[PDB]
Amino acid sequence: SNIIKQLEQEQMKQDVPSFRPGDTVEVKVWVVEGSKKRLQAFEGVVIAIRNRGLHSAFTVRKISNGEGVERVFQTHSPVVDSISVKRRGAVRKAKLYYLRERTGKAARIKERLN
């Protein structure tokens, strides 16, 4: 409705950069440990993007310490602070769920130049 959209567009963030699935992205989130807010980095491959305006989200997969870690960030949440596209990739799907069984050389994605 008009009432919902007015409440949601005033909470959105005006600086979300344009990224596609397959872009190697680097997300800086806020971490409150003890009492000092620090800014932990998270960097992997965008395997899914779900666009719903304020409720928009995206999924980042990385291979951390041998283990694969998926993390579904809420885009307009303030606990994420920066989103930076490190390396943009060339895929032909909207959601890269097949990377959950590809490792090493098989899970490469080529670079979307230009």
Partner 1 sequence: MIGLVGKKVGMTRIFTEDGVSIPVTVIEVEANRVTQVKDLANDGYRAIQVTTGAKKANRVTKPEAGHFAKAGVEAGRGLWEFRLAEGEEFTVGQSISVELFADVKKVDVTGTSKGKGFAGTVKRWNFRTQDATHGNSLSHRVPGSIGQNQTPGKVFKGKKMAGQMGNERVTVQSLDVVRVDAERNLLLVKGAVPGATGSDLIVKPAVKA
Partner 2 sequence: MIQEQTMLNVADNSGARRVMCIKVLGGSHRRYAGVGDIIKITIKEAIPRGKVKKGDVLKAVVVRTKKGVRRPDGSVIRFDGNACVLLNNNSEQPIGTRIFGPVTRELRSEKFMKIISLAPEVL
Partner RNA sequence: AGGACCGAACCGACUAAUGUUGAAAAAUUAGCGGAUGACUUGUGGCUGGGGGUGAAAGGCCAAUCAAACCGGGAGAUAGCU
Partner RNA sequence: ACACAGGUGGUCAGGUAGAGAAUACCAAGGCGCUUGAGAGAACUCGGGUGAAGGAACUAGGCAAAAUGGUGCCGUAACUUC
Partner RNA sequence: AAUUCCUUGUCGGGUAAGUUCCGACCUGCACGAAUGGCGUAAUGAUGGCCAGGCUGUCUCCACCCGAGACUCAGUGAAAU
Partner RNA sequence: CGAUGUCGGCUCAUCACAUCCUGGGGCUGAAGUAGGUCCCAAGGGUAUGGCUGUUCGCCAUUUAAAGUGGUACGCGAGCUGGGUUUAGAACGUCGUGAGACAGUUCGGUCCCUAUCUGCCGUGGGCGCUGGAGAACUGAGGGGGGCUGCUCCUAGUACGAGAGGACCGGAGUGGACGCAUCACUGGUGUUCGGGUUGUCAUGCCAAUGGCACUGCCCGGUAGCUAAAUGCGGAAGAGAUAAGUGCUGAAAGCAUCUAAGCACGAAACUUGCCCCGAGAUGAGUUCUCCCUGACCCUUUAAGGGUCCUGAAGGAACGUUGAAGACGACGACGUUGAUAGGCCGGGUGUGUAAGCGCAGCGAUGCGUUGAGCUAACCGGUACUAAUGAACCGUGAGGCUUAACCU
**Residues in 67-96 that interact with partner 1 by CB under 8 A:** 74, 76-79
**CA-to-CA separations, 46 to 89, 93, 95, in angstroms, rounded:** 10, 12, 9
Q: Which is nearer to partner 2, 21 or 88 (CB)?
A: 21
Breaks in the chain (C–N beyond 2.5 Å) sit after none
Task: Compute the CA torsion angle 37, 85, 94, 39 (nearest 10 deg).
Answer: -10
Segment contacting RNA (CB under 7 A): 9-17, 28-36, 61-69, 91-99?
Answer: 91-99
65 binds, among partner 1, partner 2, RNA, none (CB under 5 to 8 A by kind): partner 2
Question: By the criterion CB under 7 A, which residues form the site for RNA?
Answer: 1-2, 5, 20-21, 48-53, 55, 57, 59, 72, 74, 92-95, 97-98, 114
